[PDB]
Automatic annotation (TrEMBL), chain A:
Species this chain originates from: Escherichia coli (strain 55989 / EAEC)
Residues of the full protein shown: 575 to 616 of 1129
Protein's name according to its UniProt entry: Type VI secretion protein VasK
Domain of life: Bacteria
Length: 42, 72
């Protein structure tokens, strides 16, 4: 029934996580061939 | 290039299975396909050109032609 410094930051995230999607490896590095080098996950 | 843009008519598309493997080359979004693509192949053929330039260089006694062929 309380909200101080913990639910504040959570309610920051659950509104902003609506907009932007994840950022993979391929939308990094501009356009270049990265699949020949790094098979990154996570 | 001419074959590249025609594999996206419509909207990945409705012509998928007819232009499947040929547009599987140039994409660089084939992130697990053993990478089997066009771009390495043209550098894989430019060095067979390049070691044949040295035979097109001197080749003075008609040897050093087969010296690259002695490796074969």
């Amino acid at each position: 029934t309380q909200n101080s410094d913990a639910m504040l930051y959570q309610k920051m995230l659950a509104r902003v996580a609506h907009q932007f999607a994840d950022m993979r490896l391929t939308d990094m590095t501009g356009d270049t061939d990265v699949s020949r080098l790094f098979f990154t996950d996570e | 290039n001419t074959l590249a843009v025609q594999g996206c008519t419509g909207q990945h598309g409705p012509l998928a299975t007819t232009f499947g493997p040929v547009l599987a080359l140039m994409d660089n979004q084939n992130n697990s396909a053993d990478m089997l693509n066009l771009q390495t192949y043209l550098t894989r053929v430019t060095q067979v050109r390049l070691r044949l330039q040295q035979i097109a260089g001197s080749s003075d006694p008609q040897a050093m032609m087969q010296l690259l062929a002695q490796t074969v």
